[PDB]
């Protein structure tokens with residue numbers, strides 16, 4: 001029940017590397033989903049308007065914590081600044097069961113209004129970071145990194161990319177316009193993979209550029225053309241080993257990125273083929289939520 | 298574009314989709330993808346006058362949901378300049394290779410829409426698919442499955458829609474349409490039955506569900522004859538006892554179990570004799586359904 005939050009909160013967000021205008025759109029929208037049918041009828045009947053309590057946000061499962069500054073923004077907006085923090089962990093920290101991510105004090109009615117919006121953000125972004133961190137682990141021992149994609153949930157892209165970073169992964173492009181990625185359907189609608197790569201290089205030479213191949217024949221063209229980065233689409237582990245052979249023999253300056261048909265179990269096998277990157281949509285479209293709850297004193 | 302045709306405006310209403318809320322989701326999701334430029338890749342590689350047929354089909358089996366929303370994305374991007382050859386209905390079960398939609402539009406407009414349409418399709422169909430799986434496990438009992446308020450930010454109404462299409466039932470939609478006395482109300486309010494009596498006091502027509510964590514609390518609210526009790530994190534065995542104590546007391550209180558539920562133990566919880574299972578995983582942990590969009 002406020003306009004926007006205090007610039008003290010805006011500083012907290014940009015310090016963590018969160019887009020503050022996007023965080024505001026997400027937070028305001030999520031509060032409205034809960035409040036559009038009227039005030040918190042349950043709290044209004046059972047909790048005095050004057051009550052103040054302490055609240056602890058803690059995890060029940062282990063994983064990586066993301067979104068604590070955005071959760072704090074929710075609470076700033078609902079209380080209008082009238083809260084005091086005692087303890088907090090930082091986004092990126094590992095959490096075990098019972099670990100305290102936040103201990104804050106505010107008016108009881110406003111915590112009760114904010115908590116579900118705080119926790120839905122927190123449990124979701126933490127799930128993303130927790131899963132990204134799992135994928136990074138399957139790649140320990142190699143030189144392979146994990147990246148996300150554009151397969152993000154409507155409305156939560158920048159926040160899901162942020163959570164991916166907090167879990168130790170790397171972002172891909174953020175949209176259709178900040179980098180070139182030539183896909184199957186571009187090659188369906190057009191000539192060949194090679195023609196397409198030459199067309200994007202010529203048309204937009206500033207932007208970084210990646211081409212997605214579905215066969216070894218296509219891989220041969222883009223290697224002949226000296227492609228900067230190549231994405232292997234639904235290659236088997238053997239096919240990737242071949243693709244790494246053909247890459248190492250031509251331009252060792254070509255990054256190979258595997259995508260499609262990847263699961264956490266086979267992540268280790270792929271990393272071992274010598275490909276440089278795994279692009280995993282599951283990071284942001286099928287990230288199971290981390291169990292965090294908010295308990296009162 | 299600005300808004301969409303009144304035809305998609307009414308196809309959404311025919312589905313029971315909040316059309317205003319859909320507009321916000323769809324326009325936000327498109328702005329996410331275009332706020333950086335114009336789709337350099339397609340503008341370099343696809344003729345500006347190309348027109349293609351596109352098929353949406355699923356690679357895995359599940360329940361389809363969100364197709365009217367995916368269509369509204371296509372409408373906005375094309376300005377209504379598209380045509381549908383075939384479409385399945387939200388709620389239909391699909392298998393591998395099953396075609397949920399065949400559209401024809403300008404190839405460049407399809408490529409800008411492709412990812413927003415699929416992100417909506419795959420998430421909502423995922424929500425409906427998991428909900429349907431939960432329904433199967435409850436089959437042969439009188440237990441139904443219900444969602445929660447543990448929804449992804451900005452997506453509550455579309456996800457509740459998808460729970461309905463997967464064969465589940467919606468719980469309340471916000472903080473103001475139903476009473477639900479939670480663990481923290483009880484802390485701040487001294488006692489579980491103290492809080493329930495306070496709720497009946499303030500609005501006697503609004504029905505109260507009270508959320509208990511101990512068998513003791515359950516006797517307390519069953520003694521006050523609570524209309525509906527939610528068993529927070531009872532074990533399968535504690536639910537069986539909960540049902541026993543409820544059948545003893547001459548009130549037919551409704552029993553809904555919630556807290557930690559996984560598909561895993563879904564079929565077991567359905568046979569404790571509780572009436573409802575409230576599953577946050579339907580919406581906060583629904584794995585996406587693999588649908589793709591392919592050109593002719």
Ligand SMILES: O=C(O)c1cccnc1C(=O)O
Nearest residue numbers: 148149150151172173259279
């Ligand atoms: O298009 C992208 O940005 C992308 C990048 C890597 C992996 N997948 C995708 C996708 O969403 O198709």
Ligand SMILES: O=C(O)c1cccnc1C(=O)O
Nearest residue numbers: 444445446447468469555575
């Ligand atoms: O508050 C709700 O609507 C709700 C309903 C059923 C199960 N859980 C919840 C929750 O507290 O998130």
Ligand SMILES: [Cl-]
Nearest residue numbers: 016017165166
């Ligand atoms: Cl960063």
Ligand SMILES: [Cl-]
Nearest residue numbers: 265266268269
């Ligand atoms: Cl292994």
Ligand SMILES: [Cl-]
Nearest residue numbers: 312313461462
């Ligand atoms: Cl309905």
Ligand SMILES: [Cl-]
Nearest residue numbers: 511512513516
């Ligand atoms: Cl007891």
Ligand SMILES: [Cl-]
Nearest residue numbers: 504505523524
């Ligand atoms: Cl009652």
